[PDB]
Amino acid sequence: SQQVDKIKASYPLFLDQDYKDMLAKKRDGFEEKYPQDKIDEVFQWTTTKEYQELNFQREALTVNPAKACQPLGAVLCALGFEKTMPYVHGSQGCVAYFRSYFNRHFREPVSCVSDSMTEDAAVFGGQQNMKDGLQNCKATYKPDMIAVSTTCMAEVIGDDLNAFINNSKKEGFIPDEFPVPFAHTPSFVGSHVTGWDNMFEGIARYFTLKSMDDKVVGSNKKINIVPGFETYLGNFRVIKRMLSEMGVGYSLLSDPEEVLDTPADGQFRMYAGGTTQEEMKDAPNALNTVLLQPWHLEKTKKFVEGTWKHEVPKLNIPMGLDWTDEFLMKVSEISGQPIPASLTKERGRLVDMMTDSHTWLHGKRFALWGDPDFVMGLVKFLLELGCEPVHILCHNGNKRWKKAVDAILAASPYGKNATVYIGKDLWHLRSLVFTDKPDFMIGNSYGKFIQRDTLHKGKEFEVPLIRIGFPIFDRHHLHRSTTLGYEGAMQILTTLVNSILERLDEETRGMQATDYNHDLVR
Amino acid sequence: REEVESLIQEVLEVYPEKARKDRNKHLAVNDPQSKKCIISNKKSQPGLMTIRGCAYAGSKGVVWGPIKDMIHISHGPVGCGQYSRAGRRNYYIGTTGVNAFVTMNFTSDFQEKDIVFGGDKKLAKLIDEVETLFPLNKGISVQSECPIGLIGDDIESVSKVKGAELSKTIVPVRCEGFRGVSQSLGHHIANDAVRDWVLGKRDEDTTFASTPYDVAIIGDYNIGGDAWSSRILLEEMGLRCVAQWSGDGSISEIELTPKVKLNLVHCYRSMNYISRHMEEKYGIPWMEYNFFGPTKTIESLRAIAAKFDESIQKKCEEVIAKYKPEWEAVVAKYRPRLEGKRVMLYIGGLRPRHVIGAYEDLGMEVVGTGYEFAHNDDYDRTMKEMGDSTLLYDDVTGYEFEEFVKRIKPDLIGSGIKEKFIFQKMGIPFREMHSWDYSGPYHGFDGFAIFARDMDMTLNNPCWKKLQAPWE
Amino acid sequence: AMRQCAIYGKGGIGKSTTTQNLVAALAEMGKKVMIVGCDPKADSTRLILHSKAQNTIMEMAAEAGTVEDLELEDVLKAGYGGVKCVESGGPEPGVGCAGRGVITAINFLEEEGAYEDDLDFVFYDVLGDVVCGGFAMPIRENKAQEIYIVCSGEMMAMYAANNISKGIVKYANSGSVRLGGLICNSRNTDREDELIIALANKLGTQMIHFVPRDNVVQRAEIRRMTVIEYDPKAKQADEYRALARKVVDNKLLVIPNPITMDELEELLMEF
Amino acid sequence: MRQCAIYGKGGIGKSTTTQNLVAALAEMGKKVMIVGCDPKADSTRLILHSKAQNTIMEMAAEAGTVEDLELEDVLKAGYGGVKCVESGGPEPGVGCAGRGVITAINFLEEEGAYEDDLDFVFYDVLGDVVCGGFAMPIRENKAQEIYIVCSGEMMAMYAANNISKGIVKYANSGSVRLGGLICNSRNTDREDELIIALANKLGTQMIHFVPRDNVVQRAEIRRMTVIEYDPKAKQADEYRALARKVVDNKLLVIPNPITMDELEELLMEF
Ligand SMILES: Nc1ncnc2c1ncn2[C@@H]1O[C@H](COP(=O)(O)OP(=O)(O)O)[C@@H](O)[C@H]1O
Ligand SMILES: Nc1ncnc2c1ncn2[C@@H]1O[C@H](COP(=O)(O)OP(=O)(O)O)[C@@H](O)[C@H]1O
Ligand code: ICS
Ligand code: CLF
Ligand code: SF4
Ligand SMILES: [Be+2]
Ligand SMILES: [Be+2]
Ligand SMILES: [Fe+3]
Ligand SMILES: [Mg+2]
Ligand SMILES: [Mg+2]
């Protein structure tokens, strides 16, 4: 039944007595459900350390991973160049999934095409698919560039992207001079960050490899910034703002901030901003190349050092206080420009907030997960705050990154109770947060299901989630936030302290039971 | 009519020659035999931003995923599962991680060595680990991805051996994405999977007590509780709903389905294969029903009752009388805010024609509709519903849909997520027709109120009047 | 009553030729013998269908759209002695994925019931290298029940036979497929008789027959015929019918025992 | 450096001809390295004097990835200092070997392998080029010289024509060319009847011919290369002759693939 005054959506409509009776009848009659007591015993068993030992011996099953496949990162990197069409040579269901993922995260239109290989294209190859797709895409959407990635089907059968593109150019399907960079992005190795790196290396190769005879280092007096896989627009904005306040000439390669943040003014802008082809062609002339996320920019670093002859600095991600200072100092050394008073003031403001909130922040226990550089930056910043990271999880991490994070933890007295896990998924993390309960988790939307499970064990066992990472689906406009630099540090600090205070207010809202600590001033 | 044809030609004048001829056959002006007007179920033209998915999306995400007590393994690389985890709002009741697994992502997480050396051994070990860690699961399905189909992994043998060894049903589904042209072949493959591995397990069992009022809801995936909002009506009419396919559905209900008296099929496109199979093998009659809006709901309820005795018809009349004032009040409240408005739709394979009656019940006209992966029978069905000199598009592209909307200028557009923000930035209200914009249910009398309220809050929201800066 | 057999071996050993010659001999004896070529080169049915084997499942699958649309009569062509022949086909070398083509063709044939007519024999002729699970599709469950490995002297032939037995073991355990024997396609070698006899006993199989190397085979292949159709009188046409009868009467079906090929290299030193 | 690719019919004697060829170029002054391209790795047995059992694919599986694969653990010396790297793959009927070829060639590109002082890198590919992966040796920056090894028998010539059809696309898209047709023997009536005819119809030449010398099989039994087993025999002299032709080969035209009707007529023509 529905009252026209107060219409109920699924919640709380399905809590009415008629719907409860319907569900009870269905369950009792035809579902053959286990007894409720059995379900309770099994759930209790899933929260025990014995179940954790069983869970951590997995060698073949993955449950609730924390990563995606390479072509997603390839598409994200392709979107950072001006009038550029991401073109995923392979099947369509993948581009459909990529677009769906990115629309849900950004609440933005995302442009990407596929050549839609069928079974016949798998058996016979995708050269004709390559030709027809390139021609159709250029005719229909009119890009200045088409950046080609691959789905796994294409990788397994060994489709030669270079040969297919050259044959397309030679047979007149697309102009010979039209830029079509490509990269092999096999989904069965690495993750989305690897796809981003491979796509960027492909684009840089296409625009720079054959024309290095006339390049000299430092002639354009700029610094190349490679952001890597970045889903916070405030990160691009803060990097650009900090460099501009510094007076440093810079070239942000693969900058998608404009295309992912277009205004709603009655027209649909498919392309906006992005790195220009002139900037890519002039990139070897820079003073140096700075990689913001060095732990998934390995192939790019190899190419830049080997070809462009740039002495890439060994810089951690500019997250937190110490690493932002090391980034600013390195940029000042490379460019010769001093750090302005505005940056010093904003650093001092961040330190002021740190000393203001240290009392509530100290000793808190966090689990966290995400991409390698993001995770290690979060770990460092938490260590600087007096907090205690406990469960550090990175599904797409490697042993060198794990050793680096272990070194970072061992340098601080707040890392003694911290264990770094690589190759483990969110089911492992569910076991971890059940067995060694932390105060909070920090991670993407997928952690919400962990929170639910903890709340099912009891209110006292619940671990609240703090949404910092990718993807964020159940909240709006969090992709506009910042994580890099002092600004991102203040945003993260505020989110952490206010999450702690909100939880404390929730636990002390009980009248005549816990309200004695329901303080007006915290 | 001539204006629509002129717009079709103008839009087509942008594609290359082969693309132009191919796209010419998938656009038509409705004239209330679709083969002579529009052709469907064909390969998409490369590099044009189609909206269609893959066979894996139509098998794992649509058919098998909503089955709650089963564990579904996305066999292959990690991407497919990750992108399809909890993306579809097929509601269910259960304890996730104990006895329900809809929102969970189980995968083999294929590496390079898996491709080079095969993944059957890893598949067997994964089945063993699943059985160890999730004991209350009532079955396993193995949904193949593209590399599995390419390298020829014998997942059927593994399924048979492990089902024998651990005494549980393991359904291997060969839904590799490159098969077919859309999700339709995924629906088909999933349906033969159910037929071959699940449907006939209780064929020799006579323990179930059957009543003459036994009906099975077929092809309702419980989006936002939609199936529930239908089931109650069917139960208020004296009918007993034995099974639901597959939203909030259990393997026991699917096994019990061959015992029903009548099969009420909601989604023809995805479940007609199993419906016809059951009619031919067990002799169960089946028929379509439509619960979108009050008029189609009343017509469907009367049609359902007409298949039974007089008591069912009397209870149907009582149900119609009971729910009459609610939908009359909803109409009297929300129609004046909606009369005369125009809607353009682009949904997958069933909804573009089912939701038309609910739109008409609010005084709203559909001027354009189309399908992602529907067949010719779907267009045959939708020709009668659509008005004269309207627009039909099959497997429309981004450019074509944008140009069609730019020239037609509808009041509302109902479609998927991949164009929601596209049409939002063009100043036209847009309403997700796949996830119900995270709202619903829309089925039944209870869902009609939510449908009307959502239509009003989106069409008449003031934000649409603020897209031009006062100084420009 | 339909016996399903699959012919494997080292590339260039004569699988296709020996297979067609037998199908001719079986047809002369009198039995309906389907040939299924699992080679993208579309070369397994040329001495029997004459011509060049023309139509393939994959090519009309591409022509008609998807594999579902195409009808069985299009690719199924009867030839000499009523020998119905079908070839999977595939891409030109260096592109595509032939294994998927073989998988699609085999599924096509089952769902259209090509085998499930009242036949007597089905002979799959598989490529020599077998680099993926698709080319092992003829030896899955409900597929070919007997396997014949064609080999010769030297070292590469027995090496490939041992490796193919290694690969066969998994499907033999997973199903009901068994190795029926070894066909020795003599090249010119010396002591190859003892070599192959010893190798078969080492693997637990038998030497079902020995085929001499004769140029009448080349002569008949140039004119697009088998030897049974070219000239029944000649020798080397006799021990095609001979091993045809031997295959008909064969009963030793075993699971192969692959040997750590240090043992095979020793065997080469001895024999 | 002359990166070359040995293609042709399966079982026609590629790794045999290739191994004695590189051994003849060895102890002639030059430095060579063999790279195989088929899972049943035995293309370096003669030079290595033993089957490898240490290929790129199994070691990558053991370590976990090719990123952990150090180069020195898969490259070995041999007769005349010939480097040999076997790359390997799955047992028959399982997995995907073409992806193994892709991964191993990419690994050899990444780890500095080709950038030594050697003269020829001889890739040696299986007869059944069933997917694009096995066509990796003829990609861009890869081998530039294809030597189709085929015999006078009809089926070998048909395989050579099919391979030419396959490599047309790579030749047009890149710079790899058909160096010449390598002729082995089956003691047929051809040996100029359909080998020079096919070569000129493919626009190419037959670069020397090696007949059915029985010595090669008994040298194969001995783990041996002919010049290493009988360094004063007729087969060994023929193999220096082949090495000499390989040294001074200049005809590098794009293959022109003749049609099936042309092959059928050519069979009766000779
Ligand atoms: N017994 C034989 N005597 C002479 N030549 C033969 C004999 N068997 C096969 N051949 C020749 O060997 C060539 C290779 O045979 P083929 O059928 O291609 O084997 P596969 O299919 O295993 O490569 C054929 O062209 C054929 O003429
Ligand atoms: N010139 C020759 N004289 C005698 N036997 C040869 C000659 N060339 C090759 N063979 C034999 O034929 C077999 C061919 O096998 P292999 O060299 O592996 O061919 P492929 O590499 O093309 O498969 C070898 O084992 C060898 O004994
Ligand atoms: S199954 Fe189909 S695309 Fe019939 S794949 Fe799709 S929950 Fe659509 S128009 Mo999402 S043929 Fe269902 C559908 Fe309709 S997922 Fe839902 S809304 S009625
Ligand atoms: S049609 Fe392979 S991991 Fe899955 S997203 Fe694709 S690159 Fe990445 Fe596409 S979704 Fe999958 S892969 Fe095919 S079955 Fe359909
Ligand atoms: S090895 Fe087999 S499965 Fe892999 S790409 Fe080649 S033909 Fe296809
Ligand atoms: Be062969
Ligand atoms: Be070979
Ligand atoms: Fe937005
Ligand atoms: Mg053959
Ligand atoms: Mg070889």
Side-chain angles (χ1 to χ4, degrees), chain B residues 244-423:
Chain B
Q244 300 198 158
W245 293 41
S246 56
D248 176 89
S250 59
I251 215 185
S252 73
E253 289 153 74
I254 293 169
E255 270 157 24
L256 252 204
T257 308
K259 309 302 226 263
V260 295
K261 294 309 162 344
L262 180 81
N263 264 7
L264 326 184
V265 175
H266 183 38
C267 180
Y268 215 83
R269 173 79 272 125
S270 66
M271 286 282 159
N272 73 88
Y273 321 71
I274 207 67
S275 307
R276 301 177 193 284
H277 159 73
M278 290 186 78
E279 183 172 306
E280 292 171 336
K281 159 163 209 36
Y282 307 97
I284 321 157
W286 58 260
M287 56 141 189
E288 309 155 68
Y289 70 90
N290 197 321
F291 275 8
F292 250 108
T295 179
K296 258 156 185 178
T297 306
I298 289 161
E299 144 168 341
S300 280
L301 287 170
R302 298 197 180 144
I304 279 139
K307 299 278 222 278
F308 296 84
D309 67 342
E310 329 171 17
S311 325
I312 300 309
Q313 287 151 243
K314 297 207 90 229
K315 268 148 120 59
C316 174
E317 268 328 319
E318 282 133 22
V319 152
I320 291 164
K322 176 182 136 113
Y323 279 110
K324 185 155 90 212
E326 310 209 332
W327 74 261
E328 297 216 304
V330 154
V331 166
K333 175 141 147 141
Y334 280 107
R335 207 187 201 270
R337 323 181 165 163
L338 297 172
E339 337 179 324
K341 303 285 211 303
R342 299 146 70 244
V343 194
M344 273 189 71
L345 302 168
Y346 182 61
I347 339 175
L350 167 92
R351 259 169 215 186
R353 69 178 180 276
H354 266 237
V355 308
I356 295 173
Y359 275 121
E360 290 169 85
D361 287 323
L362 296 166
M364 309 186 14
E365 165 192 20
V366 182
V367 296
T369 199
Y371 296 88
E372 296 170 33
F373 42 80
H375 295 194
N376 272 98
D377 37 19
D378 290 5
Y379 282 101
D380 290 329
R381 284 162 173 75
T382 195
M383 276 174 165
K384 294 186 177 182
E385 282 152 322
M386 281 302 303
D388 295 48
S389 80
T390 42
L391 177 68
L392 306 186
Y393 28 77
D394 178 72
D395 187 33
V396 77
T397 74
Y399 170 92
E400 301 180 315
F401 209 27
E402 188 175 10
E403 286 292 311
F404 283 1
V405 163
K406 274 205 236 182
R407 316 305 323 269
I408 296 161
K409 287 155 178 182
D411 297 303
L412 177 79
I413 297 161
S415 198
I417 188 65
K418 301 195 290 304
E419 58 259 36
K420 180 188 132 112
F421 312 107
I422 285 170
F423 293 123

Side-chain angles (χ1 to χ4, degrees), chain B residues 35-282:
Chain B
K35 297 183 177 181
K36 297 182 177 180
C37 300
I38 192 170
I39 60 150
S40 58
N41 204 45
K42 309 303 210 204
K43 312 185 177 180
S44 301
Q45 293 299 123
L48 288 193
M49 288 203 233
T50 177
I51 275 55
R52 322 168 130 179
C54 63
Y56 161 96
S59 174
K60 183 238 154 223
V62 172
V63 174
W64 281 99
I67 302 172
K68 59 150 171 261
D69 40 32
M70 276 180 93
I71 285 181
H72 311 293
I73 314 295
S74 295
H75 191 37
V78 88
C80 309
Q82 195 72 277
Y83 306 131
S84 66
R85 176 185 180 195
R88 212 172 156 244
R89 300 172 66 237
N90 32 242
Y91 280 11
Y92 61 103
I93 303 295
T95 306
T96 289
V98 178
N99 81 310
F101 317 95
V102 170
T103 51
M104 302 195 81
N105 177 14
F106 301 85
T107 168
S108 45
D109 196 30
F110 257 36
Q111 272 339 290
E112 239 293 344
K113 65 143 70 84
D114 286 358
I115 307 282
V116 170
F117 293 100
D120 282 18
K121 287 172 142 96
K122 173 167 216 179
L123 184 54
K125 200 164 153 42
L126 178 146
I127 288 162
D128 283 302
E129 292 170 357
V130 158
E131 270 317 0
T132 292
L133 294 171
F134 304 92
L136 295 197
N137 78 87
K138 274 151 101 43
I140 289 164
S141 73
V142 185
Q143 313 283 326
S144 326
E145 305 168 358
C146 292
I148 311 302
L150 285 182
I151 74 182
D153 269 4
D154 196 0
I155 66 165
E156 275 90 31
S157 165
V158 182
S159 296
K160 199 203 335 199
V161 172
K162 305 306 288 194
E165 164 198 290
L166 315 79
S167 296
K168 197 182 289 293
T169 282
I170 305 187
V171 192
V173 191
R174 293 269 168 181
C175 50
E176 48 249 36
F178 56 89
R179 284 183 75 180
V181 300
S182 62
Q183 297 99 313
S184 198
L185 195 65
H187 303 334
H188 196 348
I189 291 157
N191 274 269
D192 314 46
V194 195
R195 186 241 290 130
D196 293 1
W197 300 84
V198 179
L199 196 60
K201 306 180 37 199
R202 300 178 165 201
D203 274 2
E204 337 183 24
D205 299 355
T206 48
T207 61
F208 191 54
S210 70
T211 87
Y213 315 126
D214 263 7
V215 301
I217 275 169
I218 283 321
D220 215 304
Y221 302 103
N222 209 36
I223 300 306
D226 256 22
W228 293 333
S229 266
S230 299
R231 172 188 190 102
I232 192 169
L233 300 179
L234 286 170
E235 285 223 356
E236 281 193 89
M237 254 177 30
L239 305 185
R240 190 165 69 139
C241 289
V242 170
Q244 300 198 158
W245 293 41
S246 56
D248 176 89
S250 59
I251 215 185
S252 73
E253 289 153 74
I254 293 169
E255 270 157 24
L256 252 204
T257 308
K259 309 302 226 263
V260 295
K261 294 309 162 344
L262 180 81
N263 264 7
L264 326 184
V265 175
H266 183 38
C267 180
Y268 215 83
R269 173 79 272 125
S270 66
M271 286 282 159
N272 73 88
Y273 321 71
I274 207 67
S275 307
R276 301 177 193 284
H277 159 73
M278 290 186 78
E279 183 172 306
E280 292 171 336
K281 159 163 209 36
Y282 307 97

Side-chain angles (χ1 to χ4, degrees), chain A residues 298 300-313:
Chain A
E298 289 221 330
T300 293
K301 157 128 162 183
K302 262 189 280 319
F303 178 71
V304 161
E305 305 191 84
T307 296
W308 298 357
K309 315 308 251 293
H310 287 175
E311 326 214 41
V312 174

